[PDB]
Design a protein around this ligand. Structure first.
Ligand SMILES: *C/C=C(C)/C=C/C=C(C)\C=C\C1=C(C)CCCC1(C)C
Ligand SMILES: CCCCCCCCCCCCCCCC(=O)O
Ligand SMILES: CCCCCCCCCCCCCCCC(=O)O
Length: 350
């Protein structure tokens, strides 16, 4: 009688009025997300593997990197193959309501976790680079451990609403994947949406901007300070300190790119959702929602590749364990120099 009917999940009327997209579209969708599964799990596993097992990557702050990779790993796993990919190739979500809820909840829980984790990373950056060299503070296992616990609590908190009625996780677009309900406009649903956007999204963003804008409005605070101590009878040994700042600065840079990646990837979909909840629902067409959600879902497969082309110590480790990966991005000793000087200790004024 209909092409959208699902015996397990009641599809919202809105997605029911559209014609069914072509077969080629479903197949491309499944192939697409399936490849995010491969790259995502593959790439994130490597970072988790390499970071937890390499000695040069054993600093507390790196725990955030691992947590981020775990987040992205699980997102790519659950959101790709087999729940969505298989659903696409059958042009139907054949896994039941319970799976859909788990799917949507897992998508949100780790989506909120990746930015909040980034927030914790932006904080570390502010303590090492954002503050003055005299008060510079490195991350401690204690601190880091507590921070990720906050991350986990926070992430689960703002994504579990729909699990208890304060919102919902159902099918969207072509009905082969799940997410939260941004169509229904009841008090309950709308409050959870507002909470997701404000607490889950805007929240960590503020932390980010407040930390990076704070690192920018301190580049000069540091510019001067570097000199005052430089001519401060600071001998050739000064170079060391300088290398350290370069090394840290590079990582801070990286942090911003992965954050930029996240925003560029999620902001579109976010917007399409808001239109459906506050604007012309007629704009929210099958592709209007689908294509931008795919872009968002792939977000969880980028950091690893970003790291592989800009992270020196990490690039080192790869060359030493899975060198084929660095083919087009060949590694060289010179990439780790700044870390050498920054750590090479001076023997009593040398
Ligand atoms: C494919 C499945 C998806 C995208 C499930 C998403 C769930 C969810 C609660 C998402 C929340 C958001 C982000 C994460 C970042 C961008 C803004 C939100 C609030 C849409
Ligand atoms: C749906 C459940 C998803 C959970 C899958 C977790 C697997 C991620 C890989 C974890 C690697 C951790 C290795 C630690 C090394 C020790 O030994
Ligand atoms: C990080 C783990 C958090 C624990 C949250 C557990 C929530 C259970 C998952 C939702 C199951 C939904 C079952 C629907 C019932 C049927 O129908």
């Amino acid at each position: 009688e209909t092409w959208w009917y699902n015996p397990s999940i009641v599809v919202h009327p809105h997605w029911r009025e559209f014609d069914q997209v072509p077969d080629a579209v479903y197949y491309s969708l499944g192939i697409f997300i399936g490849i995010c599964g491969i790259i995502g799990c593959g790439g994130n596993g490597i970072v988790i593997y390499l970071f937890t097992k390499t000695k040069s990557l054993q600093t507390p702050a790196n725990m955030f990197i691992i947590n981020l990779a775990f987040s992205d790993f699980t997102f790519s796993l659950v959101n790709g193959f087999p729940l969505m990919t298989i659903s696409c190739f059958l042009k139907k979500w054949i896994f039941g309501f319970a799976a859909c809820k788990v799917y949507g909840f897992i998508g949100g829980i780790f989506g909120f976790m990746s930015i909040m984790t980034m927030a914790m990373i932006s904080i570390d950056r502010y303590n090492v680079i954002g503050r003055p060299m005299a008060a510079s503070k490195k991350m401690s296992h204690r601190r880091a451990f507590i921070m990720i616990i906050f991350v986990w609590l926070w992430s689960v908190l703002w994504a579990i609403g729909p699990i208890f009625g304060w919102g919902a996780y159902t099918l969207e677009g072509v009905l082969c994947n799940c997410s939260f309900d941004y169509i229904s406009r009841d008090s309950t649903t709308r409050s959870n949406i507002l909470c997701m956007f404000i607490l889950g999204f805007f929240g960590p963003i503020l932390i980010i901007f407040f930390c990076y804008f704070n690192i920018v409005m301190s580049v000069s605070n540091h510019e001067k300070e570097m000199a005052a101590m430089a001519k401060r009878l600071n001998a050739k040994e000064l170079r060391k300190a300088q290398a350290g700042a370069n090394a840290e600065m590079r990582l801070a840079k990286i942090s911003i790119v992965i954050v930029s990646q996240f925003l560029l990837s999620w902001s579109p979909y976010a917007v399409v959702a808001l239109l459906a909840q506050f604007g012309p629902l007629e704009w929210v067409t099958p592709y209007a929602a689908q294509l931008p959600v795919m872009f968002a879902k792939a977000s969880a497969i980028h950091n690893p590749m970003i790291y592989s082309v800009s992270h020196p110590k990490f690039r080192e480790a790869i060359s030493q364990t899975f060198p084929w990966v660095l083919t087009c991005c060949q590694f060289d000793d010179k990439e780790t120099e700044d870390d050498k000087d920054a750590e090479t200790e001076i023997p009593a004024g040398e």
